[PDB]
Design a protein around this ligand. Sequence first.
Ligand code: Z6V
Length: 287
Amino acid sequence: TQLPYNEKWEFPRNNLQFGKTLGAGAFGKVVEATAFGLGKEDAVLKVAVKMLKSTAHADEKEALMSELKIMSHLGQHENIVNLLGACTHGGPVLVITEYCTYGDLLNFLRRKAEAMLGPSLRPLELRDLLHFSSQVAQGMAFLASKNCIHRDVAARNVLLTNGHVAKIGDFGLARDIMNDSNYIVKGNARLPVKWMAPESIFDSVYTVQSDVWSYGILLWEIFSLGLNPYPGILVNSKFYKLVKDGYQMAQPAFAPKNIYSIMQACWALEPTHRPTFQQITSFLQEQ
Ligand SMILES: Cc1nc(-c2cnc(NC(C)C)n(C)c2=O)ccc1Oc1ccnc(-c2cnn(C)c2)c1
């Protein structure tokens, strides 16, 4: 980001055949597409393409390029949404990432729960939630090894692909956060407050451990099967005070006592005392 962009990621834009729009923000969107002759193997693949809408401004053009430059210098990991190519010459910027078959984790969890309650006219096992949690932890630990701060870790930014493997991603400009109830007004920007660490809300500081906090909130979403954090509590000055003073969500319905203990560790008031994603990973690989 704010550095030269490598041309190894360039891809012919007329070699994309676009399909349905997957997500749409205020000034950007992710669209599914079939890419032909992508990669060394010249694979023909279904992919996700990220692009700005017709309402194009200078500030929105930089935001997509920044996301691309960070992803380019990042590297490949099985449990993150990998970059496959970009279209930077010949027209509007297109960011080509892998296509995850099952969408985000939040809807998958919320649907499977509804399908599992069908006798109110496959199923999800506890092992499945431990694999989802383990997999995202591996992705975050990989970002933590590159000093790359996600700063919106949430189930809505975790995607499931072939074999229901979890990948951490970021819709960024392609989520309509303007109208999203999980993003609260805070002046110049709209922020996912209920996922944020207190020092990010007040000091506006983002680190690996601030992502560890939000990952702790993610664990609460996974093991509640898509419940909303701090449910029914309106984000206001009392909520800020409670979070800063040490208020924590109760144990979700389906988390073992030691998964809730790992949640509480991610929700420590002091950032250095929170676990690392490597420690979260290694623990969750056991479970
Ligand atoms: C979620 C997502 N994320 C990124 C992305 C990831 N990672 C970073 N950055 C790192 C450094 C964390 N950035 C900046 C990003 O933009 C790009 C596109 C994207 O969208 C997708 C991707 C796959 N599949 C779908 C989908 C939707 N529905 N279905 C059925 C499939 C949507």
